[PDB]
Amino acid sequence: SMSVKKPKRDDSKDLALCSMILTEMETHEDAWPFLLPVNLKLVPGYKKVIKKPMDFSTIREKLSSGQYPNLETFALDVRLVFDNCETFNEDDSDIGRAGHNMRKYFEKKWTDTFK
């Protein structure tokens, strides 16, 4: 409260660390469904069903241009990618499997880097 501060995280390295994590996701061999935005013109149903599309290149642009206020808003966008993937794809599809794999991969990096 007013004039009563908790000790808080050293967050000075967060930008560099999120960038490193994003690089590792960009270079994962199962990253191919998530590298670019889904083509809303050519993929039936996607525009109407998926209210907030998100992909790695869009996250990269936002990270490079100061559009994440903190590391949690960054993690929300990464999770959005995989949440969207689960909404639109069968768990047994290649893309569905890719999504589950990448989520697991991300969350371990996240825990190991910040928790």
Ligand X SMILES: CC(=O)Nc1ccc(C(=O)O)cc1
Site residues for ligand X per CB under 6 A: 33-34, 38, 43, 85, 88-89, 95
Identify the CA nearest to 80 among candidates 51, 49, 45: 51
Q: Is the dihedral of CA 90, 91, 94, 99 positive or negative?
A: positive
- Return the number of the residue (15 or 96) whose C-beta is nearest ligand X: 96
- Return the number of the residue (34 or 74) whose C-beta is nearest ligand X: 34
Closest CB 44 distance from ligand X, rounded Å: 8
DSSP-assigned letter for residue 43? S
Closest CB 95 distance from ligand X, rounded Å: 5
Spell out the residues 6+ positions from residue 29 whose beta carbon is closer than 8 angstroms to its own: none
Q: Is the dihedral of CA 40, 45, 51, 54 positive or negative?
A: negative
- Return the number of the residue (75 or 96) whose C-beta is nearest ligand X: 96
* Residue whose C-beta lies closest to ligand X: 33
Separation between Cα atoms, residue 81 and residue 4, nearest integer Å: 38
- Return the number of the residue (43 or 76) whose C-beta is nearest ligand X: 43
Closest CB 16 distance from ligand X, rounded Å: 27
